Amino acid sequence: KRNNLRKALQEYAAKFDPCQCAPCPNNGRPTLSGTECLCVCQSGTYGENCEKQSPDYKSNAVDGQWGCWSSWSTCDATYKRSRTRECNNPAPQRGGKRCEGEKRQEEDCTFSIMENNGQPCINDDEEMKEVDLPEIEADSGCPQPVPPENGFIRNEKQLYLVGEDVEISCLTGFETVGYQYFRCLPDGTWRQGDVECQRTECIKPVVQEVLTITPFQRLYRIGESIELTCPKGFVVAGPSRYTCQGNSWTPPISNSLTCEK
Amino acid sequence: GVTLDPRGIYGTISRRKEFPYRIPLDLVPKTEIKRILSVKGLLVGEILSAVLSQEGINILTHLPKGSAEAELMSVVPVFYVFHYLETGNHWNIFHSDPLIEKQKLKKKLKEGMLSIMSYRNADYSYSVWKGGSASTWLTAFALRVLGQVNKYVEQNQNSICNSLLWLVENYQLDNGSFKENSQYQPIKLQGTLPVEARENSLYLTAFTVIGIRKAFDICPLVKIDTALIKADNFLLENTLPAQSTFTLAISAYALSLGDKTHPQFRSIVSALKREALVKGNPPIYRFWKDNLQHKDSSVPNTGTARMVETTAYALLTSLNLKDINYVNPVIKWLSEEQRYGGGFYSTQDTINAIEGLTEYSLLVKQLRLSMDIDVSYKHKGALHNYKMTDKNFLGRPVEVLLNDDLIVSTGFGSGLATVHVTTVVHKTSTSEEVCSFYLKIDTQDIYKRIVACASYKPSREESSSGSSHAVMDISLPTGISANEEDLKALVEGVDQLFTDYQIKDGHVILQLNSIPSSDFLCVRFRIFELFEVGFLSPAT
């Protein structure tokens, strides 16, 4: 309602901005009810819309005020539209004075992209609810089970129904022995079992800011090898070549081949 | 069991699967072997009708071209609004002849290719002007786009590969892995926010990986594979961008095209979850913000750009993990005025919003159930054939009968139905590794008395140390009862073996500390009968 209400104020101003009034006599500000303009008068000016003066006020003649904006000049060759106004209510002729506030606007050429289809309800406090408590959950079913060692749930939901199923499998180094779905039983359990992750690949270990290693591959198959390497002219720590072992290699990672380059 | 997948989901494709036939050694000799196969039609759930309007013609028919290449802002989103309409059958909604609109598109898009190519440098970089200083960022935007459009209209591979090799040769650092020439200014409605205060390397390394990944399908040569592996790895190893979800999201989205099953990638998205914004008890709407600096702007701003770009990258991360259940409350957030403008005619945002609906509408058609599934044996003939639709989603079990390897397959089609095969078997005690403690029992008249005899069996490398602690069950026919006060001797006697006993479900349970493998331990008890039944099942 706030967004819409700014947006209505923009349209309301476009319709009812008193810039559209004929020039105010004796340097009053034009003001518009919606259906009539009246001028707000300066000290020493009076009448319905400022038409007459006290004998002292006649000395001013400063006369600095706007007429309306032009419509938008379309995009400026950096995709920004603009518009300008021209100081052109009764001009600073006998005396001299600037009309106040920046003569021009620039506004990004923004337009709509998608099928309009109404508007959604939004309230200030809500959006920062990254976490909230588990619901009353009367459609009992099951919540997400914690997947096994090195595991990943393929289809993700808050609450799976009775007889509804979830698929799992091991991460990139690894493969499932056994059946890789589970299903929510009527009591709320998953009966997780008869599945086991096995290693088939290994991944470039964590190393110091000097590369003490040569990165041959994204993933290394078990029985392949990786090499610790000095950039030039020295030897420091760790095996020169290593092969992977169902576990990781037992690689040097507290320190690596940090040679005197 | 498996999902079938005729179309590509879960980083792979699954139009065919084969299940072996096994003959275990444990088996009861004269057994029958039995098997059952059934298939579940996994429907999409709800679909949210998220679309570009007929006004999508105004997104093609760009705002005034000009200097500093506002002509570039005029070319690039055409290469997306095409792809949306193409994946959406959408030209019909225009109400011209769709073919005339498709021909108009293919032509205007080719005019676009010459138009963007006109800003290529002889070094195959690009710039803000034809005479400007080169930019890797804009080289990477061009590579993101060229990666798109060669799925539709081909351009020669060298024109891509040289533009790649400018970037990949001259700016691929180590310990941090893509770098830039400091162009004059960020273009006020193109580029986007860097990492603002400092540390732009994450936004560079991500946006450059995002370009290079899109192009890499159309320049597959060894160098570029060698580059992206490290351009990812240094991005991954740097990526903990908690200072900005916009940085967490472009870094996540880049990595979503990578190895989707790398633990650091999974961890990054697990942080992206922890960063999410929601509304409702279940998630009704979902989106993201990082800088909590806020105004309810009716005309959008770079603050909106933080949201729309961080969200469009989270959305594209999720839509490269293929789950509409996760994606839905985001697609609800788009298309109606959360923080206005569909990308506000920032090209970067508006591109990423159109890309959102494109991958969403693709996944919608990939997921729907319109699939035909066949099952056969490997050496033997066909077993069954199934047709799976918005009505016939449940695929009833069919027996599996013929003792051969089982092949299930599909053609082209759509959806993600899953086929489950169960096997039933009966296995021996003595001829299997299930038994460590080998059993005998005898019933004799001297009401009657019963003596069990049994012994442990160690592994081949092990001595006669005896069995671990065990729970033993003497079953009896119903109405037969053991002499419990005689049984108390097994508990009271100085030569103790059992800790405790109980009667439960009519069975006699007793718990034994260890068992000899040196000899058969023998144990005797006595029974009285209040005979209860006409048929008695064998006791265990």
Curated annotation (Swiss-Prot), chain A:
Can you give the residue ranges of the TSP type-1 domain?
63-110
Q: Where is this region: CCP 2?
A: 187-261
Spell out the post-translational modification annotation for this entry: All cysteine residues are assumed to be cross-linked to one another. Individual modules containing an even number of conserved cysteine residues are supposed to have disulfide linkages only within the same module.
Which cysteines pair up through disulfides? They are 19-68, 21-37, 24-39, 41-50, 75-109, 87-99, 142-184, 170-197, 202-244, 230-259
The ranges of region (CCP 1) come to: 109-186
Query: Which residues are in the EGF-like domain?
Result: 21-51
Carbohydrate-modified residues are 66, 69, 72
Domain Sushi, first and last residues per copy:
140-199, 200-261
Q: Where in the cell is it found?
A: Secreted; Target cell membrane
Quaternary structure, per UniProt, is: Component of the membrane attack complex (MAC), composed of complement C5b, C6, C7, C8A, C8B, C8G and multiple copies of the pore-forming subunit C9.
Q: Family, per the entry?
A: Belongs to the complement C6/C7/C8/C9 family.
Linked disorder?
Complement component 6 deficiency: A rare defect of the complement classical pathway associated with susceptibility to severe recurrent infections, predominantly by Neisseria gonorrhoeae or Neisseria meningitidis.
Role this protein plays: Component of the membrane attack complex (MAC), a multiprotein complex activated by the complement cascade, which inserts into a target cell membrane and forms a pore, leading to target cell membrane rupture and cell lysis. The MAC is initiated by proteolytic cleavage of C5 into complement C5b in response to the classical, alternative, lectin and GZMK complement pathways. The complement pathways consist in a cascade of proteins that leads to phagocytosis and breakdown of pathogens and signaling that strengthens the adaptive immune system.
Name of the featured protein: Complement component C6
**Taxonomic source organism:** Homo sapiens
Curated annotation (Swiss-Prot), chain B:
Disulfide bridge map? 161-219, 453-522
* Coiled coil residues, start to end: none
The gene coding this protein: C5
Q: What is its subcellular localisation?
A: Secreted; Target cell membrane
What does the annotation say about its assembly with partners? Answer: Complement C5b is composed of complement C5b and complement C5 beta chains that are associated via disulfide bonds. Component of the membrane attack complex (MAC), composed of complement C5b, C6, C7, C8A, C8B, C8G and multiple copies of the pore-forming subunit C9. Interacts with the tick complement inhibitors OmCI, RaCI1 and CirpT1. Interacts with cobra venom factor (CVF).
What's the superkingdom here?
Answer: Eukaryota
Function statement:
Component of the membrane attack complex (MAC), a multiprotein complex activated by the complement cascade, which inserts into a target cell membrane and forms a pore, leading to target cell membrane rupture and cell lysis. Complement C5b is generated following cleavage by C5 convertase and initiates formation of the MAC complex: C5b binds sequentially C6, C7, C8 and multiple copies of the pore-forming subunit C9.
Glycosylated residues? 175
State which stretch of the full-length protein is shown.
941 to 1492 of 1676
Activity regulation description: Membrane attack complex (MAC) assembly is inhibited by CD59, thereby protecting self-cells from damage during complement activation. MAC assembly is also inhibited by clusterin (CLU) chaperones that inhibit polymerization of C9.
Phenotype upon changing residue 26 to Y: Confirmed at protein level
Q: Which organism is it from?
A: Homo sapiens
Q: What is this protein called?
A: Complement C5b
